[PDB]
Structure 1
Amino acid sequence: GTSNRDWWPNQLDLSILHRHSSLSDPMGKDFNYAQAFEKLDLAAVKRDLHALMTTSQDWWPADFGHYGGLFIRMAWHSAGTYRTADGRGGAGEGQQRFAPLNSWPANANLDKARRLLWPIKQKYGRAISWADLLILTGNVALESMGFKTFGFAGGRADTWEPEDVYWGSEKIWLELSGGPNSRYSGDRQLENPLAAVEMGLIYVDPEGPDGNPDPVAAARDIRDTFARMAMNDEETVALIAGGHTFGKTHGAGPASNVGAEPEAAGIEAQGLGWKSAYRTGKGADAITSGLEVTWTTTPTQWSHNFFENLFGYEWELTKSPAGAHQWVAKGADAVIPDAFDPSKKHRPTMLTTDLSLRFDPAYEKISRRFHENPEQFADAFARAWFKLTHRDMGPRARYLGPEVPAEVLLWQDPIPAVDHPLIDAADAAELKAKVLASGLTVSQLVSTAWAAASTFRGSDKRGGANGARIRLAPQKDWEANQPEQLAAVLETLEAIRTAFNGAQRGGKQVSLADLIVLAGCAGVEQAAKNAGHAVTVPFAPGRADASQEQTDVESMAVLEPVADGFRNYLKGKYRVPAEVLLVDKAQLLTLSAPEMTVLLGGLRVLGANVGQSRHGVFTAREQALTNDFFVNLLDMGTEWKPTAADADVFEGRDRATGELKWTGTRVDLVFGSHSQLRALAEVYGSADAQEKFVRDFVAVWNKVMNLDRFDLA
């Protein structure tokens, strides 16, 4: 069946903005997961999970009689797809149960793990999501095996179709670097936004880079990919050694015995995959990764035996029974228990990537410290597991249930509690009149509030206007934010604030975060008045101001917009065309195509462009809120051509005289070119549409201003 994708494989794809419709969702449109979860008996679920750990099923028997290691791995894979570049991936939507992640080679036999959880999921129904259950199961596994966790938050709502994520361009699973779709170039530079070394892996190749078993070069890939998942050296060593305290790998015979991944298997397999023709196909004969390593002498119990073994032996390169590279301890006795046969024991073994923790010099110092001070290892792993499994959940206001840790962590981008009366509607009217009387323009007011709010991304629920981080490093210096113009606006708003706060009784005060957003609303109201329309823009107070010490500058760098079509901004030249980058940004802001359309047309005429560029400013009444962008864009009296100097800039000329009327970028003109976008632009550029344009614009403006407002839920 030939599709539009087949004929025009480079046309823009708008269907990523219309996912997650009420159509695909089986729950009612009033379903609120937070409310269902807050009534769950969480203690009862944990008891059932504890029982499950040692209730072996014959279709996938438990190693050592205990499923703990399998479930820790299941939870670390759920969380492990996270990339800090876009916030996409992670455990927070339960995507491991959908394509493609359900079928990634690195997720082999996690299908079995999820199926073992079906009875519990069934018993508790809508009150616990799959997404929450995968993480909670990991926690229970750790607890069952003697490790005390740092805590747990519920609230990850289930999703019902696959997320649109760019996982890479390779067309072969586990393709090694340098191919026609290589994710690597230069001196082993991994392309943004990717955070894994091969297609279908979580972070790195356990045999070493491109399969070459050198622990030192593996360490370099470990460091780069874990940093791209927001983890530093200490967290990385704690997580890897912590995880590999438990369980085992599975490589009992050749990989060619393993059949189709779940999305390719027959219908009779009922959602499972990787069926194996090697001996019994499971248990003692299991094949998952192809490696055959068991790390400690008590694989079902928390121990300090990982680092005793790593440092206490010298290591020899060898091969598993499937042919994979792995390491065995020189001269050791057979001290490692067998998973099924009490009369067998095995020598200690390690992956190349485990040896990285000893042979990379910076890791070695951390690993030695953890070896000599196991209580520090325990605490570091507990904190890192919490971070790993919660890093994509967003502000602490979304954390549900009775095990949420009280300690505030820097990586949560924390926002102080509000402890004072908030401004009311009379106060807001007074503050808007003050903002307008100060001389700040529409363009300055709109641009500043857009800059503050538009850092939000729905993928990990980071960013937005709450916190007033626009005033702090590094946001205040981002080129897209226009740092000199920004400084002058914030200085005037800070004087307004100081004067209003100084006059109040009781404890009433306004935060700068609220005033930035309020001043943007006044801008939009003034712009509507310039056009002859009487419009009130909704505002909700309650934002608070975070400090510089609560704002990790390195972690904040990934929110920098290097492309923001809403301000017609591009920081450099990229391989991806600018209109694909606009749709990507709309997706992170949670906008539909009609919302993206309205929003961009309105921003153009209000003067939100970076550096006051005229590109896309198709109006003779700038700073007035009108539908001019659409009416002028669609005027067939104008002809467009790319410029000689720059192919990404276009001149719009009167068709009859040749006279220049406008210029635009690709972000501008795509609205008059892409056949779906142009259909939307036509609605807003019609003669009956001016009031609809204004109303829709105010709605989407308000939506963006509130994206991070999880305190108002």
Structure 2
Amino acid sequence: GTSNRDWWPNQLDLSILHRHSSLSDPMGKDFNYAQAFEKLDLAAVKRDLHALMTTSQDWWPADFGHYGGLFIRMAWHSAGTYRTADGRGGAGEGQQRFAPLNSWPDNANLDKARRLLWPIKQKYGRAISWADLLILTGNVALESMGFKTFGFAGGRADTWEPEDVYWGSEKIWLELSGGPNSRYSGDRQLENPLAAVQMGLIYVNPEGPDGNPDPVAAARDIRDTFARMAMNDEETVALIAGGHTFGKTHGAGPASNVGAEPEAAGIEAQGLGWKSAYRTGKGADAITSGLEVTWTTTPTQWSHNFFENLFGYEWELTKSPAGAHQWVAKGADAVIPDAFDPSKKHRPTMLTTDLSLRFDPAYEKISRRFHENPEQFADAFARAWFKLTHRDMGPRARYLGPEVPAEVLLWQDPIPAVDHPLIDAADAAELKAKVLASGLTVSQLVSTAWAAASTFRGSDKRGGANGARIRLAPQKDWEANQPEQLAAVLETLEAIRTAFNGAQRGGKQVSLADLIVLAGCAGVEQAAKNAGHAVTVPFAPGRADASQEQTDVESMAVLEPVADGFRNYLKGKYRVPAEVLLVDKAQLLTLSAPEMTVLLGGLRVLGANVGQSRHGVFTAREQALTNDFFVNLLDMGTEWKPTAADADVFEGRDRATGELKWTGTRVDLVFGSHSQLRALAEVYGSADAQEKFVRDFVAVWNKVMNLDRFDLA
């Protein structure tokens, strides 16, 4: 059956904004996962998971009699898809159980791991999500094997269909670099937003870069991909050495024995995949990666043996029984136990990527310090495992249950507790009147509040106006935020705040974070008034102001908007067309297509464009909230053409006279071109739609202002 995607393979895809509707969701529209989880007996679930660790099933027998290593890898993989570039991937939505991640080659046989968990999932039902269960099971695996975790938070609601994520353009699984859809260019630069070296891998290739077994070169890839998953050198060495303290790899025979991945298998496989014709197909005969490495002398117990082996032998290149490159300890005794046969032992072995930890010079120093000071290794690994597995969960307000660590960590972008009375409605009116009397313009108020609130992304729940981080480095210096204008607005707001706060009794004060948002609301009210409409814009107080020391400047850099269609901003020229980047941003903002449409049309006429550009400002009453953008965009009296200077800018001329009326970008004009977007524009550009436009705009404005307000959830 030929589809629209076949006929117009580069048209824009709006379905990404309309996933996750109530239609695909089996839970009622009233289901609240946080409330269900709060009633879960978490201790009881952890007792069942402890029991599961050594209850081997015949259909996938446990190595060493203990599933701990398998489950740690399962949890690591659930979390390990994460990219800091867009916040997409991670454990937070339980996406490992859906295509494509359920069938990635690096997730081979994790289908068996997930299936082992079905009895517990069934027992507890909706009170524990798959997403939480995958992570909890990793924690319990670690605890069972002697390792004390830093903590655990529930609250990851399950999702019910695959996310739309750009995982790369390759059409072959695991394609090596340099092909027609290469993710690499230049001096082995990985394209943003990607965070893995090959399609279907988590981070790097365990044999080495593109299969070449050079541990020094592999270190380069490790460092780059882990950085792109928010991990520095110390965390990276702690995580790899930590994880590879446990368990083993599986490569007992040639890879050609392994059949179809889950999404390709027959219906009788009942959701499992990679069935193997090699001997029994499982247990001692298991094939997963094709490598055959067991790192420690006690694979089911926490030890300091990883670094003892790493530094204690010299390593020789060799091949697994599937033909894969791996390393064996020169002249070692057979000290490693076998997984099934008590009468066999093996020499210590390593992956190329394990040797990276010793032969990259910066890693080597960390690895040595961890070898000499295992307490530091244990602490770093615990902190890094917590980070890895919670990275995409958002503000601390979302953390549920009795095991949440009390220590606040820098990576969480923390927000101080509010310890004073909040402003009430009378105080809000007083502050909005002051803001309006100060001489700040609609355009300045709207642009500042948009700049503050629209850093939010729902993918990892980072960003938003809470914290007033727009006043700190680096947000205050981002080109999209118009630094000089921003500084003048913030200075006027700060004086207003200082004056209000100094006049108070009883400890009441207003944060700058709240006042920025409140001032934006006043701007929207004033604009509606300018258009002859009487509008109150909703406002919820309670934001607090974070300090510069609570704001990691490097980590913040990935939230910089290099494309923001809502302010008609593009930081440079990109391979991806700007309207694709607009839809991408709308998706991160959690907007539907109707919301994106109304929001953008309104921002254009309120003066939210960067640099005061006239592009898309299709009104003669700027700073008045009207549907002018739509009515003028859809006017057939105007003809549009790309400019001579720039193919991405368009001139709109009176069809009869030739006179120039407007200019716009691809982002402006896509609303009059794409057939679904134009149908939306039509609704708002109709003669009966003025009040609907205003009201819809206020609702989406308020939605954006509140995106990070999990303290009110």
Q: Normalization by structure 1: what TM-score?
A: 1.00
- Cα distance, 1:122 vs. partner? 0.1
Instruction: Report the equivalent of 1:271.
Output: 271
Instruction: Report the equivalent of 2:502.
Output: 502
- Cα distance, 1:336 vs. partner? 0.2
Counterpart CA distance in 1 for 2:624 and 2:379 is 57
Deviation string, structure 1 residues 351-382 (Cα, Å, up to 9, x no partner): 00000000000000000000000000000000
- Cα distance, 1:396 vs. partner? 0.2
**1:400 and 2:436 are equivalent in the alignment:** no
- Cα distance, 1:89 vs. partner? 0.1
SS in 2 for 1:318: strand
Instruction: Report the equivalent of 1:117.
Output: 117
- Cα distance, 1:594 vs. partner? 0.3
Counterpart CA distance in 1 for 2:236 and 2:535 is 53
Instruction: Report the equivalent of 2:575.
Output: 575
- Cα distance, 1:10 vs. partner? 0.3
Counterpart CA distance in 2 for 1:284 and 1:538 is 63
- Cα distance, 1:212 vs. partner? 0.2
- Cα distance, 1:224 vs. partner? 0.1
Counterpart CA distance in 2 for 1:196 and 1:617 is 41
Counterpart CA distance in 2 for 1:291 and 1:24 is 39
SS in 1 for 2:155: coil
Counterpart CA distance in 2 for 1:89 and 1:298 is 33
Counterpart CA distance in 2 for 1:431 and 1:58 is 69
- Cα distance, 1:466 vs. partner? 0.1
- Cα distance, 1:194 vs. partner? 0.1
- Cα distance, 1:129 vs. partner? 0.2
Report how many aligned residue pairs link the two structures.
Answer: 713
Q: Mind listing any 5+ residue stretches in structure 2 that lack a counterpart?
A: none
- Cα distance, 1:127 vs. partner? 0.1
Counterpart CA distance in 1 for 2:684 and 2:54 is 62
Deviation string, structure 1 residues 172-217 (Cα, Å, up to 9, x no partner): 0000000000000000000000000000000000000000000000
Counterpart CA distance in 2 for 1:68 and 1:643 is 62
SS in 1 for 2:230: coil
Counterpart CA distance in 2 for 1:566 and 1:444 is 15
Counterpart CA distance in 2 for 1:306 and 1:554 is 31
Counterpart CA distance in 2 for 1:359 and 1:676 is 55
Deviation string, structure 1 residues 549-603 (Cα, Å, up to 9, x no partner): 0000000000000000000000000000000000000000000000000000000
- Cα distance, 1:322 vs. partner? 0.1
Instruction: Report the equivalent of 2:608.
Output: 608
SS in 2 for 1:711: coil
Counterpart CA distance in 2 for 1:389 and 1:325 is 30
Deviation string, structure 1 residues 202-249 (Cα, Å, up to 9, x no partner): 000000000000000000000000000000000000000000000000
Counterpart CA distance in 1 for 2:520 and 2:218 is 49
Instruction: Report the equivalent of 1:673.
Output: 673
Counterpart CA distance in 1 for 2:464 and 2:635 is 36
Counterpart CA distance in 1 for 2:636 and 2:304 is 74
SS in 2 for 1:661: strand
Counterpart CA distance in 2 for 1:272 and 1:403 is 33
Deviation string, structure 1 residues 638-660 (Cα, Å, up to 9, x no partner): 00000001000000000000000
- Cα distance, 1:446 vs. partner? 0.2
- Cα distance, 1:509 vs. partner? 0.1
Counterpart CA distance in 2 for 1:705 and 1:376 is 42
Counterpart CA distance in 1 for 2:13 and 2:356 is 41
Counterpart CA distance in 2 for 1:554 and 1:317 is 38
- Cα distance, 1:691 vs. partner? 0.3
Counterpart CA distance in 2 for 1:530 and 1:381 is 58
Deviation string, structure 1 residues 120-175 (Cα, Å, up to 9, x no partner): 00000000000000000000000000000000000000000000000000000000
SS in 2 for 1:240: helix
Counterpart CA distance in 1 for 2:303 and 2:636 is 74
Counterpart CA distance in 2 for 1:233 and 1:604 is 44
- Cα distance, 1:412 vs. partner? 0.3
Deviation string, structure 1 residues 22-64 (Cα, Å, up to 9, x no partner): 0000000000000000000000000000000000000000000
Instruction: Report the equivalent of 1:13.
Output: 13
Counterpart CA distance in 2 for 1:583 and 1:451 is 18
Instruction: Report the equivalent of 1:251.
Output: 251
Deviation string, structure 1 residues 9-32 (Cα, Å, up to 9, x no partner): 000000000000000000000000
- Cα distance, 1:332 vs. partner? 0.2
Counterpart CA distance in 1 for 2:599 and 2:356 is 49
Deviation string, structure 1 residues 60-112 (Cα, Å, up to 9, x no partner): 00000000000000000000000000000000000000000000000000000
Deviation string, structure 1 residues 647-680 (Cα, Å, up to 9, x no partner): 0000000000000000000000000000000000
- Cα distance, 1:290 vs. partner? 0.1
- Cα distance, 1:411 vs. partner? 0.2
Counterpart CA distance in 2 for 1:529 and 1:158 is 43
- Cα distance, 1:307 vs. partner? 0.2
SS in 2 for 1:640: strand
Q: Normalization by structure 2: what TM-score?
A: 1.00
Deviation string, structure 1 residues 598-634 (Cα, Å, up to 9, x no partner): 0000000000000000000000000000000000000
Counterpart CA distance in 2 for 1:477 and 1:709 is 25
Counterpart CA distance in 2 for 1:523 and 1:146 is 58
SS in 2 for 1:506: coil
- Cα distance, 1:414 vs. partner? 0.1
Query: What is the RMSD of the two structures over their aligned residues, measured on CA atoms?
Result: 0.2
Deviation string, structure 1 residues 397-419 (Cα, Å, up to 9, x no partner): 00000000000000000000000
Deviation string, structure 1 residues 471-495 (Cα, Å, up to 9, x no partner): 0000000000000000000000000
Counterpart CA distance in 2 for 1:610 and 1:445 is 13
Instruction: Report the equivalent of 1:366.
Output: 366
Counterpart CA distance in 2 for 1:703 and 1:22 is 18
Counterpart CA distance in 1 for 2:669 and 2:345 is 69
SS in 1 for 2:23: coil
Counterpart CA distance in 2 for 1:609 and 1:431 is 25
Instruction: Report the equivalent of 2:659.
Output: 659
SS in 2 for 1:710: coil
SS in 1 for 2:354: helix
- 1:226-625, aligned counterparts within 5 Å? 226-625=226-625
Counterpart CA distance in 2 for 1:45 and 1:526 is 54
Counterpart CA distance in 1 for 2:241 and 2:566 is 45
Instruction: Report the equivalent of 2:34.
Output: 34
Counterpart CA distance in 1 for 2:427 and 2:4 is 54
Counterpart CA distance in 1 for 2:706 and 2:90 is 24
- Cα distance, 1:264 vs. partner? 0.0
SS in 2 for 1:43: helix
Instruction: Report the equivalent of 2:711.
Output: 711
Counterpart CA distance in 2 for 1:661 and 1:41 is 66
Counterpart CA distance in 2 for 1:264 and 1:305 is 40
Runs of 4+ in 1 over 3 A off after TM superposition: none
SS in 2 for 1:712: coil
Q: Mind listing any 5+ residue stretches in structure 1 that lack a counterpart?
A: none
The sequence identity of aligned pairs, in percent, is 100
Counterpart CA distance in 2 for 1:181 and 1:212 is 20
Counterpart CA distance in 1 for 2:480 and 2:707 is 20
- Cα distance, 1:506 vs. partner? 0.4
SS in 2 for 1:546: coil
Counterpart CA distance in 1 for 2:691 and 2:388 is 47
Deviation string, structure 1 residues 500-533 (Cα, Å, up to 9, x no partner): 0000000000000000000000000000000000
Counterpart CA distance in 2 for 1:226 and 1:429 is 48
- Cα distance, 1:341 vs. partner? 0.2
